[PDB]
Design an enzyme around this catalytic site. Sequence first.
Site, PDB file in Angstrom:
ATOM      1  N   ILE A 119      -3.495   5.613   6.225  1.00 14.34           N
ATOM      2  CA  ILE A 119      -3.100   4.350   6.838  1.00 14.34           C
ATOM      3  C   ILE A 119      -3.848   3.205   6.170  1.00 14.34           C
ATOM      4  O   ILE A 119      -4.170   2.200   6.812  1.00 14.34           O
ATOM      5  CB  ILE A 119      -3.344   4.362   8.357  1.00 14.34           C
ATOM      6  N   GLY A 120      -4.140   3.355   4.883  1.00 13.53           N
ATOM      7  CA  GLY A 120      -4.795   2.303   4.129  1.00 13.53           C
ATOM      8  C   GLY A 120      -4.736   2.509   2.629  1.00 13.53           C
ATOM      9  O   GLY A 120      -4.523   3.624   2.154  1.00 13.53           O
ATOM     10  N   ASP A 142     -13.349 -14.242  -2.408  1.00 10.66           N
ATOM     11  CA  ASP A 142     -12.172 -14.610  -1.638  1.00 10.66           C
ATOM     12  C   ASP A 142     -12.147 -13.803  -0.344  1.00 10.66           C
ATOM     13  O   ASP A 142     -12.517 -12.628  -0.315  1.00 10.66           O
ATOM     14  CB  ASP A 142     -10.917 -14.366  -2.488  1.00 10.66           C
TER      15      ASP A 142
END
EC number: 2.7.11.1
Lengths: 269, 269, 228, 228
Positions: free
Chosen positions: A15-16, A123
């Site tokens: 899931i990533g 960022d």
Amino acid sequence: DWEIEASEVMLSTRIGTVYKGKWHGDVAVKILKVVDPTPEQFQAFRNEVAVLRKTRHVNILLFMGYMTKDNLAIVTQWCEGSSLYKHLHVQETKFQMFQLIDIARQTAQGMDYLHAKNIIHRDMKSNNIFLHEGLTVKIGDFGLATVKTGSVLWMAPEVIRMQDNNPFSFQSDVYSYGIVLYELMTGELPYSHINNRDQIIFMVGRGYASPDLSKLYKNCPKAMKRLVADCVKKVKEERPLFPQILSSIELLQHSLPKINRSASEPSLH
Amino acid sequence: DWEIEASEVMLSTRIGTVYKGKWHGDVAVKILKVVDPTPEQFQAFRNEVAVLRKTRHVNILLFMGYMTKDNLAIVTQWCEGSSLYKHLHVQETKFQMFQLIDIARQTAQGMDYLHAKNIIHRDMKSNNIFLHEGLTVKIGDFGLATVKTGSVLWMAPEVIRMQDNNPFSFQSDVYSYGIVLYELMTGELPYSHINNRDQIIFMVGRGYASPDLSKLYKNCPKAMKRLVADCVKKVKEERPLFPQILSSIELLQHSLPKINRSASEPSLH
Amino acid sequence: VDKEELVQRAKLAEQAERYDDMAAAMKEVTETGVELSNEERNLLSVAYKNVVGARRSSWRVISSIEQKTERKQQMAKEYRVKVEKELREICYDVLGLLDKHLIPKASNPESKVFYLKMKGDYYRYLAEVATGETRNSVVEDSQKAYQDAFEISKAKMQPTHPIRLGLALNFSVFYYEILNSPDKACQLAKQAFDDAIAELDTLNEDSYKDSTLIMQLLRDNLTLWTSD
Amino acid sequence: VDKEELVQRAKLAEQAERYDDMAAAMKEVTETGVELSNEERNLLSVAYKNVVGARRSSWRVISSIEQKTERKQQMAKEYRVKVEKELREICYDVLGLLDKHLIPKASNPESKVFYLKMKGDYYRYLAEVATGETRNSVVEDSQKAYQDAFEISKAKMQPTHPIRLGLALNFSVFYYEILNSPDKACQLAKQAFDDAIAELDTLNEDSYKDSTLIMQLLRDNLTLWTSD
């Protein structure tokens, strides 16, 4: 050291890259996703390890260890909560004003620790800021973090420029937090009235245009407006640093009221 | 490394030695409390530093750094929540059974990580187990922790024996966890029917008497009683280790029901 | 002989979440005609407060829906008038009961200040929805009733006392919301806060624990009024 | 011509937290004598469910207080009798309306299964407090009403459907609590769970989202019944 044997790990779901699993507890394992690590990829992974090994803060995703056997992965804490991008507009949670300052102060305190330990997260967006459990804020991935493209809404006009693409100072992080604060306050997204990423990043990158500042709420005080204005500026020669921004946010949190309507005496017994 | 300049720290209140303050955020600073650090005291504080530098778990109080200038202090995470000793009987919170297993599983997971990293927390009680925020469990101080008196209720008969006061194995931490378990399960304290610490520690230290287990709750499954019995045993030659205790607690949590009364269809719209 | 039975029924109705029955039992127990104690006095206060608060919350939501915009407008108007009728009925009931049987027979200053505070409260609840000459009259009665209780409190009643603090809180919220004069409300909250802090040290554990709640509400209202 | 006005009043009363007025408006809007839509049918269901649930919670607390021990015992008995009278009145009201105006005129299997489920539900609420021959009669009526709805659901109604799942949930909880035969309840819940999982894949996002709630309640009741 922090090297963890590959046999004692479990990878439940994909899931990533990031693999949900268990390791003496529910953890998150970020597998490299490429079988062969080119020397540059290995260099990037040791930079990631070094940048994670120096952060220990209650507002930063915890580092658990790294596994280098047959694949490169960093074991990090697993948090049960949305990434705050859903709560922004996707989930539409609509936090109250008094709970809408605590997130800003917690993000500032974590970024304070990062900058104090000479760590530049570079960022960051609203997704990396994890709202784990009861409003506690955790800083997410450090993929671009270095010790000294899909979405351009939360990234500095200087940072696009990169005439030499060498420099990354603290003011980039200052604007990153400021834009996060703007999104957190108004609960909306600027430059979303249109669908031309190239045009919006051309106008904001070169100073043609600025994010609109009038979408903010009737309840927010005037001091919040000044703070957000001093955050989102075109020029970052002396954009105000994170210690004083945390001081200002703490002062403003102190003066804020935490009820919307005057409350009388509660029910007796 | 983790050394933090003494000038950049603030000590608000003396509510612990331990000094509540702020350090890029609200932290806890444990000042040494003696002006001169004898060589043995310095050795103990570097042992504390070394034992804390290897723990990074979401169930362990976070280590932030150590300040060695004019005094010795370890900067640790500040948690807003009771130490679970109040919630036991002093605060009398009276958790429900389904929330009464999660604390046990989380404590077992933290102890799993500690033991996997070759860290023995040695003696521990209900106070060191911090119930921070929404039921999350954090392991407290590591004062007695080493990598290989007021209350005797939560401490092993072998540990009192100390014929050579040399040995300290993992089974001591087992009973430490098992006794924390029943305390958590039953909401009460054994050996509290009387007020003779010497007599109770004489009878439990030498195997004369055992903690009563019949004070445990009616809602309990039969498996939980078996687990607590296998925890609190007189003999710890093969007292069952923390991996299998966590497996058993996870299975029993899976098999548990989470409502007291059958629930029909909820209100429509 | 029936007084214990009525208070018992009131307690049962409180535990059963049916406030109307406990309010009725409270009404009977006072209409009997003997001096009331702290327990039954607080039972009356909580029962009447609960029922009036439910009615007031319903009226607030009704008015909020009515504010938006065609027959829905007049339908919401009639609904608001019905809720107003119920609120006026309960408020006038409690005010008449206070006037006839309670304040006159009240013996100790503590009782007098409590009953006068309750009368001023319910006149404030009436004023919150009343308009015109009736609004002016109920405002005058509210101000007179609190001021009298304020005089008795300053004269005799203790300065750390929870009832004095609650009187200050309610007087301030009346000043701010109804009289539309926030200056007096802020002043009154400030002096009450200062006196309570002045005598805060000698407080016991339990007295500190109940007083601090009204203190915190005073602080929150003061912050809300001072803020823009 | 008045139907929209009554439905608007019902919605306003729902928003104003006064369920009795919305229940009365719902009663009028059905007593008028035309076919009802999903919105007004659900408004009726939620209004009557809310009022009956408030009465039932009050009765539960009253009985729990009565269980403990001397005039308190007969006082609690009288209070329980009063709450029983109110509960019986509202239950018989809704059942009479259901028999007379709703189920007979119902035209769509979906409507028929919903109204039969509601009838069985309110007979269950009656049985929860009724004793003796009346208890036996209401139990028989509940089982018959639930079984007919089960037949129509199996015959036509979609097996992933939230109403089918809710019917299974209510039938199982009736079997467990009233009939004191947990085996049938466990079996019924298990088969409903299995069929829903079998047809779970083809569900849309919204249908998934409402169905999963009743699924979770089925799982919780199954766990509670299976555990010791």
